């Protein structure tokens, strides 16, 4: 839900605002991390994409006229 | 960042996947709450939009070939 993950070619693209992102390879190795978004060039194989959302609270002021 | 908030006419539209949304009026009253998104019809005045993201961790399996 609060992220997108997609693969095209060898490219894994991950988008998740205010989230810590991690990609693990099959050996459980952290091959990349980034906040918010990532474009990872992978090799053939299976990967685990981890999205850790930060769980903050935000407030916005809105004026209705 | 992990949400959008916009007022158009008397309509307040809020979008934030996996989040608890709240709108408070000027008296501090909860006038609406929803998961993930809402379309609120307001009266003239000032509103506080609160976005409480859930802070969960997600994992997706990705295959590169
Ligand atoms: Ca409350
Ligand atoms: Zn490691
Ligand atoms: Zn090593
Ligand atoms: Zn770790
Ligand atoms: Zn921080």
Residue numbers in the entry:
A (entry chain B), B (entry chain A): 672 to 736
What's the paper's own text on this?
In addition to the rIgSF-CTD tandem of the Ig-like folded domains, we solved the structure of the rCTD alone. Crystals were obtained from a fragment encompassing residues S664–K736, which crystallized in the hexagonal space group, P65. The structure was solved to 1.9 Å resolution and the Fourier map enabled us to trace residues K672–K736. The asymmetric unit contained a dimer of rCTD molecules (approximately 75 Å × 21 Å × 14 Å) in a side-to-side arrangement, with the monomers related to each other by a twofold axis. Superimposition of one monomer with the corresponding domain in the rIgSF-CTD tandem revealed that the conformations of strands s1–s6 (corresponding to the 55 N-terminal residues) of the rCTD were very similar. However, a significant difference was observed between the polypeptide chain encompassing residues V717–V735 corresponding to the s6-s7 loop and the last strand (s7) of the CTD. In this structure, strand 7 was swapped between the two monomers and constituted the primary interface between them. Thus, in this conformation, the s6-s7 loop, instead of a turn, adopts an extended conformation along the s6 main axis, bringing s7 to interact with the neighboring monomer. The equivalent region from the neighboring monomer then occupies the space generated by this movement in an identical manner. This domain swap, as a consequence, generates an antiparallel β-sheet between strands s6 and s7, as occurs in the absence of swapping, that has the same backbone and side chain set of interactions, with the only differences being the monomer that provides s7 and the conformation of the s6-s7 loop. Of note, this C-terminal export signal is the same region of the protein that strand swapping occurs in our rCTD dimer.
The virulence of P. gingivalis is dependent on secreted cysteine proteases called gingipains (RgpA, RgpB, and Kgp) that are essential for corruption of the host immune system and acquisition of nutrients and heme – a vital growth factor and source of black pigmentation of colonies on blood agar. Gingipains are synthesized with a typical N-terminal signal peptide targeting them to the Sec translocon and are exported through the OM via a novel secretion system referred to as “Por Secretion System; PorSS” or following the naming convention, Type IX Secretion System (T9SS)7. Translocation of gingipains from the periplasm across the OM is dependent on a conserved C-terminal domain (CTD), which appears to be important for secretion of the proteins and in particular, truncation of the last few C-terminal residues of this domain leads to accumulation of gingipains in the periplasm. Here, we show for the first time that the OM translocation signal, a conserved CTD of RgpB, has a typical Ig-like fold encompassing seven antiparallel β-strands organized in two β-sheets that are packed against each other in a β-sandwich.
